[PDB]
Design a protein around this nucleic acid. Structure first.
Ligand SMILES: Nc1nc2c(ncn2[C@@H]2O[C@H](COP(=O)(O)OP(=O)(O)OP(=O)(O)O)[C@@H](O)[C@H]2O)c(=O)[nH]1
Ligand SMILES: [Mg+2]
Lengths: 102, 99, 134, 225, 52, 257
RNA sequence: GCGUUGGAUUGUUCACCCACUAAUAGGGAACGUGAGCUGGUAGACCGUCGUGAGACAGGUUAGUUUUACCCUACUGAU
RNA sequence: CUCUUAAGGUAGGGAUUAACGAGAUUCCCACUGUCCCUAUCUA
């Protein structure tokens, strides 16, 4: 229970830093927030695409209705084959409403 | 608390009663400047304002007194607050004579 | 001060927390608040006075420009049973209120309805602004 | 008003008829009345009277002294163990340091201990949760800066404390950071511009506290050069 | 409601509508204003400040 | 306390080049609020005329008064005329700019001082001192009204090791573009999530969860991390907590207190 | 010697606010363990903890001592 | 060290939300001896 001490000389190991050498090294991580998608973008239906897997049922129904209404402006685009890929498996869905919307 | 309140009442009577040498009229301003040396005037009144410090001492030492566990401790804290007030006022010997 | 004459005694009708009428067209309808000038100091007793007594008051009903604003003025009617030192007991239909500055000078310029004899004798500008005494 | 009007009035009319005689007689009776106030004025007023009279005596003694008087090493070695200035300080009981605190509606659990004296917690303190904290170091009894004096230079400075290395009472108290008398602390000294041989700036030094800051809000200390 | 002027008139319109009036015919302006001020904060009345 | 040659010695040393580089990097780092230092305890943060000598209050004014002429003297005598006219014009201007008879205004009701109290602010400072993170809840109707800048200044000066983020709440009451505008305006300084509090229909829950577990990953040594909720009354602190837990944990009411 | 107020405020008051006033001075006889009258265990809920029974860093709510006719003192009466 | 976070508000109509209760609480009208400030009467 001393106020000053040494480990030992410890032959073989790196020597040491003496007693008072200041260590000016650090690391600074940067925080990352979500975007939250509060501002309308042209790529907005690509985000509603995945709501066809939503655990809720009215969500899926209203999403299918939105995609129904947005057909003529997207019929020739990079979104239609993923739309059908992600919506075809709703044939085995639990709801007459969603099957009818499809 | 009473000792603090007395000092700040006194100092407030000085600060509010005395005029603001700026903010009055240019004629009176220049007259009182050539009479009393505006710089000295403002400096003295600023000294009194900054001394009105006493509030800090009173608040700090009261908040310390909340944890007093003995008559001797509480007495010494009281004495300390009043002594620091006295030091502040002792450093106000010349401005009050001027004022 | 402001009044002309002595502190004379007529019975008390108007304690603190009493809404009384204003009938002049300065804008107010009502007068409430705390204070009575020349009131004593006794434990548990209410400040209540008349004798053309000056009191602090606010407009409970009236124009917003003078609502929210404390003001002095003078009792002119009481509706309690007062005694004249010349004979009979007097009393009015109602209480009445009305407005002034600390010197006794009125914000309004004319009074409706009767005003008390002793109130007018004590306050000159009330007697000038009143067309009807008693 | 308007100027020194009473000075003008004294020049024009003049002070009274019975002014100089009365002033002379007041100055004469003052000798009697001084002693009268001494044998009277019971209490604080007599105490203050005696204080004033003693100070006045000393002033006149010094004045007369000044009147009547106005009527081997070299320069560089003039002005000149490793023991600290305070070994063997008063010992503090654990009872006098820790206050008991009781918890519950029916207060029956105590298990909590409030440190009564001034403390140094650190820079990133961040209190523990209440169900998990046992040691309580209240915010008012938490010091960041001390009043450190260099014995040389006759100078003091309000320096920020960096650490507590040795409180002589029960080195638990060092880890708690209790600033009792005789406690040894690391303080920053960058304001003084000290530099070692090599050009490395010194920014930390040992100091020993000289006061009992539980009685005074001040933490006064002496540098160990 | 509709088409008011004069918030003093607004209150009396709303009181005559809600049947919120005193013994007589004086519409209770005080309680109606209290309810309006509760609605304003609680979000029954939509309102918002614009930023720069 | 025994003698030792290890007292009286320099205990903490640093070279000038390392010192200056360390100053520069941290001046870069700690101006950015999205950045955060990891340890913060092993690091040195501590490394980051007068006329009375001439005139003695007594030669200026008094019976002694060794002061006959000024030093506040303009030459070219017309110059002080140019000054006096300018000063009179400025004076008359201030008069009409800032532009009594024996009536007063009624007392302020004692209910308007309810947020202000020793009892409440003791709880505030207790919560902060116990917290590792401080969320500042704002109403999207009036965030700058509901901001409380003095607490942020206190947290800057006193406690830089705390994190101090913003949460816009009641975003369901205003349009989406107002919320986006405010979030853009405030993300410049502080992260500033948007939120809507409800046990059933919520918004921002997962984002806030992600941010809190980020701070947890940073404070890996503390064994737990405390998050205080600061703000005006009736902003939704209790409702945000009830939203995170997804049941009624804290009492809630539309009345403030 | 004689007086030293009326009120607002329980998201609380070891206090402050505005008025009236001649003034709105401080204290004791209880609080140097514990003593008029009035606000501030058993049931139940939320929170923290606990494997649990339960406990508490908490918080909210409801919730039965009942003299004098005895001696003395005091007040009046034979 | 890296990047995904699908407790994503489906929409900017997303929360303006019964009746009942010797349940806990605040305010208003009316009303009064609760109060100023006590007085009187009956068994
Ligand atoms: N529309 C909407 N209302 C909210 C939201 N959050 C809270 N509220 C409402 O705001 C009312 C008062 O806010 P509180 O939840 O009490 O927030 P608080 O005042 O910080 O809570 P306390 O700490 O208990 O005082 C609640 O009764 C809620 O009904 C929100 O996100 N959207
Ligand atoms: Mg609230």
């Amino acid at each position: 229970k001393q106020d000053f001490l040494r480990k030992k000389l410890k032959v073989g190991k790196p020597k040491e830093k003496a007693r008072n050498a200041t260590d000016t090294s650090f690391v600074s991580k940067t925080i990352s927030i979500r975007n939250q998608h509060l501002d309308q973008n042209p790529h907005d239906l690509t985000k509603r695409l995945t709501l066809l897997k939503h655990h809720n049922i009215n969500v899926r129904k209203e999403t299918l209705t939105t995609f129904q209404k947005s057909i003529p402006s997207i019929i020739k685009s990079r979104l239609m084959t993923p739309l059908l890929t992600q919506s075809i498996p709703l044939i085995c869905d639990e709801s007459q409403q969603v099957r009818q919307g499809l | 608390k009473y000792t603090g309140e007395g000092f700040v009442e006194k100092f407030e009577d000085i600060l509010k009663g005395f005029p603001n040498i700026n903010d009055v009229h240019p004629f009176h301003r220049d007259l009182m400047d050539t009479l009393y040396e505006k710089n000295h005037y403002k400096i003295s009144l600023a000294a009194i304002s900054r001394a009105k410090l006493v509030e800090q001492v009173a608040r700090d030492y009261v908040r310390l007194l909340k944890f007093g566990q003995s008559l001797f401790q509480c007495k010494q804290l009281k004495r300390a607050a009043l002594g620091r007030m006295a030091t502040i006022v002792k450093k106000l010997r010349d401005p009050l004579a001027y004022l | 001060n402001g009044a002309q004459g002595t502190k004379f005694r007529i019975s008390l009708g108007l304690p603190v927390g009493a809404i009384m009428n204003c009938a002049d067209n300065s804008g107010a309808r009502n007068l409430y608040i705390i204070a009575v000038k020349g009131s004593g100091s006794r434990l548990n007793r209410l400040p209540a006075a008349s004798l053309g007594d000056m009191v602090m008051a606010t407009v409970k009903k009236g124009k917003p420009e003078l609502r929210k604003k404390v003001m002095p003025a003078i009792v002119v009617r009481q509706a309690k049973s007062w005694r004249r030192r010349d004979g009979v007991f007097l009393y009015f239909e109602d209480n009445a209120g009305v407005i002034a500055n600390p010197k006794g000078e009125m914000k309004g310029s004319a009074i409706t309805g009767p005003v008390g004899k002793e109130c007018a004798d004590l306050w000159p500008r009330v007697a000038s602004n009143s067309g009807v005494v008693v | 008003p308007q100027n020194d009007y009473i000075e003008r009035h004294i020049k024009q009319h003049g002070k009274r008829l019975d002014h100089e005689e009365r002033k002379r007689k007041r100055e004469a009776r003052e000798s009697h009345k001084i002693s009268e106030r001494a044998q009277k004025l019971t209490g604080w007023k007599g105490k203050q009277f005696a204080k004033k009279r003693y100070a006045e005596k000393v002033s006149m003694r010094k004045k007369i002294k000044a009147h009547e008087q106005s009527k081997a090493l070299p320069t560089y070695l003039l002005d000149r163990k490793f023991s600290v200035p305070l070994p063997k300080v008063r010992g503090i009981s654990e009872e006098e340091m820790f206050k008991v605190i009781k918890t519950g509606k029916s207060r029956s659990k105590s298990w909590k201990r409030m440190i009564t004296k001034h403390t140094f917690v650190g820079e990133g303190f961040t209190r523990r949760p209440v169900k998990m904290e046992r040691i309580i170091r209240p915010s008012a009894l938490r010091q960041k800066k001390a009043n450190v004096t260099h014995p040389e230079l006759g100078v003091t400075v309000f320096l920020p404390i960096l650490a507590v290395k040795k409180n002589p009472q029960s080195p638990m108290y060092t880890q708690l950071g209790v600033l009792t008398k005789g406690t040894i602390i690391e303080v920053n000294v960058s304001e003084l511009g000290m530099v070692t041989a090599g050009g490395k700036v010194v920014w930390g030094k040992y100091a020993q506290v000289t006061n009992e800051p539980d009685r005074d809000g001040c933490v006064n200390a002496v540098l160990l050069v | 409601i509709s088409g008011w002027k004069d918030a003093t008139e607004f209150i009396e319109i709303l009181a005559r509508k809600q049947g919120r009036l005193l013994k007589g015919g004086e519409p209770d302006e005080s309680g109606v204003s209290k309810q309006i001020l509760n609605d304003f904060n609680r979000g029954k009345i939509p309102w918002f400040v614009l930023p720069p | 306390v025994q003698p030792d040659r290890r007292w009286f010695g320099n205990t903490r040393v640093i070279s000038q080049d390392a010192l200056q580089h360390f100053r520069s990097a941290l001046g870069e780092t700690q101006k950015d609020t999205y950045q955060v230092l990891l340890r913060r305890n092993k690091l040195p943060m501590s490394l980051l005329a007068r006329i009375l000598d001439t005139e003695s209050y007594a030669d200026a004014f008094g019976p002694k008064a060794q002061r006959k002429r000024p030093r506040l003297a303009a030459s070219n005598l017309e110059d002080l005329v140019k000054a006096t006219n300018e000063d009179i014009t400025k004076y008359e201007e201030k008069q009409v700019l800032d532009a009594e008879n024996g009536w007063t205004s009624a007392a302020k009701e004692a209910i308007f001082s309810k947020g202000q109290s020793k009892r409440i602010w003791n709880e505030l400072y207790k919560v902060i001192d116990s917290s590792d993170v401080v969320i500042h809840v704002l109403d999207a109707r009036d965030p700058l009204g509901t901001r409380c800048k003095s607490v942020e200044e206190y947290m800057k000066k006193e406690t830089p090791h705390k994190h101090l983020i913003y949460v816009l709440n009641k975003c369901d009451l205003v349009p989406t573009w107002v919320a986006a505008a405010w979030v853009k305006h405030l993300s410049k300084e502080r992260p500033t999530l948007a939120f809507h509090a409800s046990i059933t229909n919520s918004f921002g829950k997962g984002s806030l969860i992600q941010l809190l577990r980020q701070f947890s990953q940073l404070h890996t040594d503390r064994k737990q991390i405390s998050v205080g909720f600061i703000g005006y009354p009736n902003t939704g602190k209790s409702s945000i907590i009830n939203t995170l837990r997804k049941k009624k944990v804290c009492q809630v009411a539309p009345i403030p207190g």
